[PDB]
Design a binder for this molecule. Structure first.
Ligand SMILES: CNC(=O)c1ccc(-n2nc(-c3ccc(C(=O)NCCCN)cc3)c3ccccc32)cc1
Ligand SMILES: [Mg+2]
Length: 182
């Protein structure tokens, strides 16, 4: 039961330095909690374009979330979520980059705005997809609904709407209550 998990994180211009860091901290928190397990990780920043900040092979080598994310540079551009999810599916979940054949694939998408592009995420549909939408851009129910298409079903399970970046701590608290030895 191997799990290959990718964090796909928003690096758009809307994000303040502390908000961007809170996103990184949440990613680190999850990885640290799941150290020395069947989980292996990759992280991809997305804005207008995409950057694999570290891949699965990097994670195996270092096993240190602080070191792996120490040299991330905030892109400060747009929010091309469709393109980003497609990039993960076709350019990140790859054996060449340390992905394990037949592993359970998981995506955690973290964003603070509506997608600035369009299309489909068919290429990523076999990945278990969570999306975390954070902050004032997701005030309306309408804006929150736009995230449903990116996530696995039902949205009640896979879509998390947080009013503040501080709430990432509370989300991590909740997530950990779902951790079991099987
Ligand atoms: C193979 N699958 C996996 O490895 C795998 C499976 C699940 C996840 N999860 N799980 C959560 C989660 C689940 C439940 C609750 C909750 O019960 N809240 C109650 C609120 C009461 N006021 C809160 C958060 C989550 C959130 C963001 C991203 C990924 C997440 C990650 C990886
Ligand atoms: Mg934004």
């Amino acid at each position: 039961g191997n799990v290959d998990l990718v964090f796909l994180f928003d690096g758009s211009m809307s994000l303040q330095p502390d908000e961007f860091q809170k996103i990184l901290d949440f990613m680190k928190d999850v990885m640290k909690k799941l150290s020395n397990t069947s989980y292996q990780f990759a992280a991809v920043q997305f804005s207008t374009s995409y950057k694999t900040e570290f891949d699965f092979s990097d994670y195996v080598k270092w096993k240190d979330p602080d070191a792996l994310l120490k040299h991330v540079k905030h892109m400060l551009l747009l929010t091309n979520t469709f393109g980003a999810i497609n990039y993960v599916a076709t350019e990140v979940f790859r054996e060449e980059l340390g992905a394990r054949p037949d592993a359970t694939k998981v995506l955690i998408i973290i964003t603070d705005g509506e997608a600035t592009d369009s299309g489909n995420i068919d290429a990523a549909k076999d990945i278990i997809r969570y999306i975390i939408g954070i902050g004032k851009h997701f005030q309306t129910k309408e804006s929150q609904e736009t995230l449903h298409k990116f996530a696995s079903k039902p949205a009640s399970e896979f879509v998390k709407i947080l009013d503040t970046f501080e709430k990432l701590k509370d989300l991590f608290t909740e997530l950990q209550k779902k951790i079991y030895v099987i």
